[PDB]
Subunit: 360 residues, 4 copies
């Protein structure tokens, strides 16, 4: 059931800007995002913590909101002009989606804002107005050995990747890389507005669920330091996967888990995608260098676990099961297959993960 | 069973200096060590390749010798004076070990040298005299993104760790770190002469076998590049384990496999141990941060596979089975267990490896 | 003052390549390929086409053999084929000389417009380019000093506000500038692609080309370039740096090619893509504005820059700056700079910082 | 010349700590703790004891409040308790003033000998020291500019060959030096622990302490110290660097504390533990010998250094160097340097 291209013009989206995550214990979440990861507090009270990255000048990149059920409440994109908020509302209304408009914002430090239940069930926000804060980009007196410098992207789990992809393309996102097989299945797509590999991404699976939110560092040693610090804090069990080099995106990466199991990616040194004919890279799902370039196996939780998302009433969205083939199953499952070199039996894996492991 | 302390004085050992590895295909081995890893050729012909690291001034750190059976032929330590070669001879003769002395060396670029079949079955060489070569430490016109800068250590597999450790202490090696359990079994020990965490190390297992030879890089990004390069060359299947941060030694590391399955470790940034009361560190075998500080699982091959070693006639040394408990079995096997925090079931793993894998 | 055309500006994506005239193609090849590691897309006896590690367009740099070393063309890529028509109509309304070739001026570029712009610089605008193998994951080739992207140009021009207004009308947004308390502007940086700049204006006699800048992934890659140059015993071709910039916050290095074209190596500036991106103005006497660590700026950096050509290949006449000189006001005989505004301690009178 | 004693030399392991007199303890604390990130081992209203990230002995630096900023002692650890007795007999034979404190001079050091050595420097030798928590895996504490080890001292002394021979007799091995064709020695670097140096001699008016050096893991940690100093608007306290040294091949930075004591931050020199380690001699006119990239050495780096104290805490009188001056022969009015030997292109004359 293809999502039609509206007649109404798409809003001009600049970039991913922030996520609002509902968390169950505000103090525990603060310990993770401020004490462990070093994000900078823009505002806080007994109910919410507003955080930003080192180089950010808008009010925040992450809002932690206390609530009964941990979930993504909104993933927010900044648009180019005030008028683009109106455009977003018209566009989503033409799509038959539920929308909510608040002239003075949903969260502090954001002004006129539109939230929508998008066609894939995700809570998106579009805004232009935001309170500017001290840009900390040269505050080396504050700089952490693991400093998170920008918000980079979101990654969403959705059962039908082509359907979602076409809709995001009409919205103005361009696909930079994807993962497909030779039987017409798409397992994942990455798409951008700001000229990096992505602002959001679609990962095939039961959904809507939020896979992760990604922050960047300046250098690879910064990511190493986050791992090292987690070991010193004896929370290495909260390192889910990595560190590694991605095939898709070519970024150096790490995946960690917050106190409510919300997955955070730390990411650095992908490439420029701003030209409109940027070459789209398609990896085969059985290429064992596509997710980790070094061939390290992808732990099953990375495929199966992701966060709930909320509707505009704050209720959890029903999960719709994926019927397309599962990346987990076709790569590391019982009938799975992966290769190191296409066409070479040597360095290939049948019914198990790479590097001597099987599914727990 | 115990190896007695000789009345004869131990030779004053400076450091690990080089290994001679037998390889089956000299050209394939050359491609690995020179073209992939960037080691510097000090001499080569149809029978051997002599290689050194970027900062070395002695003739070589690695001799690849063509032969029918891939194996370690000699682990060589440089001694402080010519007279220390005589001391090595008298010492091992007193221990009842087979020795062979060549005034003009066993390999090119080494002078007066003593080889011995040591009490643990290993072929050790002791030498002072060596041909000095151009020290390439400032040849940044040659420096590669993955540059190997020193030889750091060897790691030996032997069935009875305390037996070997006592013997090495009498030779002057001082233990820096080890792995034990609460019931008094020793699994591994690291010991040094040169003021780093180790020059050699004992890993409990069937032996004698050579577990690995280790080279150092300047920085962590150099190790990352070796991984990246191996992905680009589509030989990621030869990255065995890593990259990571060690618990033991605190070094950043990587384990890769040469064309004959000889394991090479790349290592950086361990600490100073030269003071005589250098604090020893003992880790519990069930501590999942002891080998990889970030908790990443140790692939079973790392525990089970190691290179054959030769006797002085060039024949393979018979293997003696370990009877003490197996590290693999007590940690990642079906009956093993490991913990993130001592005493905490959260972040513990029972009958499987960390992060969600079981053994393949 | 340069008027704003009625005609719509072209939609400019980014700086894309420079064409440099060099006098000895072999010596230039040694510097750019052997020393700096750039990748050859094409070469013959007259020209070398080079690209950075992550590029997919044909080239980021063209070395063209010629009698007088100079900038021949600074090229920006535009969003669509129709934007090259928009560029042509725009520069015509501006009264500028233009030349358009449906098959390009250099190999690997198709339909292209070159202009002598209102400040005397040879701009090219194009969309069509021959795609080549993007080397971004070719870690088998990766150098310890690898140049990964083309980042920006920097232009010397006598009247900065005049130039700034023209580039703003063309769609560039000022991210950072350098001014004083007496109304003088000494420099401005401006962008299309969401980094600190795609081009920049440095106040001085002009038109001249100050430098062309390439990126590395990390700081250590820039350190390696310096280390390599020492090993090759060509450290005399390191002009300034390495350092941390104040303006841009990037880690940097300035080196000189065999014809004294200045190349900057640059890494890790910040995102400027939001339209209300806060502008940062530095005082010209702030000794942390160019080098954040207070290291002195050698006079050659201010005084030396490359000639630029018109569309016929002749050198552009240099027009003298009459506004105050950043050299003179900070490190000349009557210069001044401070470490902390209003503190005599750490200030410099009539001399450069650090002794 | 300084005669070799018949008494055996103490077996010196390494440079271990310096005691610096500072005039304003709180300002000094800001610098070494807040700016540089050193770790407190003990403090009171008169002294701050500080250590690096990987240290297990009590401290690498003692800041002592006093009227005149100076080096009070540069301390070397010896291998055994008996080596303190050896040091005492050795310096007594040399005719030096010595002072033995069986319970140490500063907290966390036990039996210790301080001497006014033959070059006028206050050396300490000790074995016993209170072990503290070794912070080497305390990544929860690790700074982006983390100082990981004490690496070396550098001493200004007028006659380098005289001092060199005295240090060699004590067991130090020279690794690198700077000379000219006329036979003058301008500087020498010498070690016990298997790095390029534990101490070094810079030709000049002395005794003065040129600097104390700490190590970082990587080059980016040094860059961060500079960046942090910029952010704190104290970039005027960056003296020289960052750079790559020629001698030592280390990546380096020189900064100045509140009393103008010079601190070097240093990383990635090479192994020198073999007894036949090849010695490297640079020509004083080679513009890549100090900074490999050919950046100029600011004259203050040659002319400024810290006072040193005698055992009564009074400042040691200075002896003027009579041998040729490295500043004068390279950057002075009749000085010169080269990039490539024999090439006027890339050479500097009177600048
Ligand atoms: O080359 N020099 O200027 C040097 C080399 C090493 C040092 O530790 C130093 O203080 C100076
Ligand atoms: Ca298929
Ligand atoms: Cl992935
Ligand atoms: Cl290990
Ligand atoms: Cl600048
Ligand atoms: Fe991601
Ligand atoms: Fe090892
Ligand atoms: Fe620039
Ligand atoms: Fe030094």
């Amino acid at each position: 059931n293809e999502i039609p291209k509206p007649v109404a013009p798409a809003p001009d989206i600049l970039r991913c800007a922030y996520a609002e995550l509902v968390v169950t214990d505000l103090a525990k979440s603060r310990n993770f995002y401020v004490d462990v990861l070093g994000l900078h507090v823009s505002y806080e009270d007994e109910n919410q913590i507003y955080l930003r990255s080192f180089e950010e000048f808008i009010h925040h990149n992450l809002v932690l909101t206390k609530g009964p059920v941990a979930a993504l409440k909104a993933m927010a994109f900044r648009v180019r002009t005030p008028e683009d908020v109106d455009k977003a509302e018209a566009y989503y209304q033409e799509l038959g989606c539920r929308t909510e408009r608040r002239k003075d914002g949903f969260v502090k430090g954001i002004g006129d804002a539109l939230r929508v239940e998008d066609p894939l069930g995700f809570p998106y926000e579009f805004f232009f107005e935001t309170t500017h804060v001290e840009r900390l980009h040269m505050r080396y007196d504050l700089y952490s050995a693991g400093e998170l410098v920008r918000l980079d992207h979101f990654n969403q789990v959705t059962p039908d990747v082509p359907r979602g992809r076409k809709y995001l393309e009409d919205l103005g996102f361009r696909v930079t890389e994807d993962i497909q097989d030779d039987e017409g299945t798409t397992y994942a797509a990455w798409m951008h507005r700001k000229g990096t590999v992505h602002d959001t991404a679609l990962t095939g699976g039961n959904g809507p669920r939020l896979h992760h939110v990604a922050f960047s560092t300046h250098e690879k040693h910064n990511i190493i330091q986050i791992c090292d610090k987690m070991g010193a804090l004896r929370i290495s069990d909260r390192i889910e996967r990595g560190p590694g080099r991605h095939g898709v995106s070519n970024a150096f990466y790490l995946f960690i888990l917050d106190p409510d199991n919300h997955r955070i990616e730390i990411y650095t040194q992908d490439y420029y995608t701003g030209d409109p004919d940027n070459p789209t890279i398609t990896w085969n799902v059985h290429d064992n260098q596509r997710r980790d370039w070094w061939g390290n196996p992808v732990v099953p939780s990375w495929y199966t676990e992701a966060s709930k998302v909320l509707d505009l009433d704050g209720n959890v969205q029903e999960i719709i099961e994926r019927t397309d083939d599962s990346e987990l199953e076709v790569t590391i499952g019982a009938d799975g297959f992966s290769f190191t070199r296409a066409g070479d039996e040597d360095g290939s894996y049948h019914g198990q993960a790479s590097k001597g492991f099987k599914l727990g």
